[PDB]
């Protein structure tokens, strides 16, 4: 289970979206190293221009690559569910604006870790910070709170993202998440703990298409 994460793991991400009716597709690839807690990915909007700011999709775009220290390794649900994988589902409320709903299947297919995502956004304001692309191209660190959900054989997660806005203000994105195993086998249901997450966003100077380079560093504690 955790044996699959002993070294570098290539990743594929596939997302199909519809936000306020604007359909779009994103494809991503890169690699993850759970030993370091390191994720390194590049995403391309394949249908043209992304109708939403890239930072709003960071959380949607593989927590099995979190580094769990040795004394916390029996609390790593994400790896224990591999390779058959897990369903990750979210609702994300952007304060005073729209909401996203996402369903993602994260599982090994061969040696590649794949994240396949369907995203539906509604209630966004035409002249608001998200459909107006008034979000800065950065991210902040956040703690993610992980609880067991023995009844569905998985975990529930709640956390709030602070997106920096181009005017100095901050826009909150309230995340509700649950993960349930795809496989019929047994998983690790953890005690309460959190993942400390850092994310850095950049651009490929040689990439002419609309895109985002994402680096994440993730570590468990508590």
């Amino acid at each position, epitope marked *: 289970g955790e044996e699959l994460f002993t070294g570098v793991v290539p990743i594929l991400v596939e997302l199909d979206g519809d936000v306020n009716g604007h359909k779009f597709s994103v494809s991503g690839e890169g690699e993850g190293d759970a030993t370091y807690g390191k994720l390194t990915l590049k995403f391309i909007c394949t249908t043209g221009k992304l109708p939403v700011p890239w930072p709003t999709l960071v959380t949607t775009f593989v927590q099995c690559f979190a580094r769990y220290p040795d004394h916390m390794k029996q609390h790593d649900f994400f790896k224990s569910a591999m390779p058959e994988g897990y369903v990750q589902e979210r609702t994300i409320f952007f304060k005073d604006d729209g909401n996203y709903k996402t369903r993602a299947e994260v599982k090994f297919e061969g040696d590649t870790l794949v994240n396949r995502i369907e995203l539906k956004g509604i209630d966004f*304001k035409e002249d608001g910070n998200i459909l107006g692309h008034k979000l800065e191209y950065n991210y902040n660190s956040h703690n993610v709170y992980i609880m067991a959900d023995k009844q569905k054989n998985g975990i529930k997660v709640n956390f709030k993202i602070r997106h920096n806005i181009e005017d100095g203000s901050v826009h909150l994105a*309230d995340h509700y998440q649950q993960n349930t195993p795809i496989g019929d086998g047994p998983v690790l249901l953890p005690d309460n703990h959190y993942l400390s997450t850092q994310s850095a966003l950049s651009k490929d100077p040689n990439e002419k298409r609309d895109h985002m380079v994402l680096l994440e560093f993730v570590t468990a504690a508590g």
Partner: nanobody
């Protein structure tokens, strides 16, 4: 399954105030947000006010600081306080409850009419 019961619609004069309430029953633990949408004549449904399990509050454009939403987590009821009402607030107000997965829960709808 969860069930939503609405009450408190009706006739009101301009400048006056109204309250809507909505009680939810059944699988309460799955609800992450509850609140209200409205649909005015000839217009598409627009979100008005929600409050999430964490207590965060989110208003659509029709609020304009005139609508307030509160939640009685004990009696699993949500309330919409609407005041300084105008004729253009005339519409059908729908209670709405959200879960993490696709697909919402909706109430039957309640008419609100503002006129002299």
């Amino acid at each position: 399954d969860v069930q939503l019961v609405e009450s408190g619609g009706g006739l009101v004069q301009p400048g006056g105030s109204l309250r809507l309430s909505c009680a939810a029953s059944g699988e309460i633990a799955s609800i992450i947000a509850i609140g209200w949408y409205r649909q005015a004549p000839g217009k598409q449904r627009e979100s008005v006010a929600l409050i999430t399990r964490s207590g965060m509050i989110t208003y659509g454009d029709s609020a304009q600081g005139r609508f307030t939403i509160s939640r009685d987590d004990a009696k699993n009821t949500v309330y919409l306080h609407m005041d300084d009402l105008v004729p253009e607030d005339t519409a059908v107000y729908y209670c709405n409850a959200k879960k993490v997965s696709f697909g919402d829960y909706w109430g039957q709808g309640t008419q609100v009419t503002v006129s002299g």
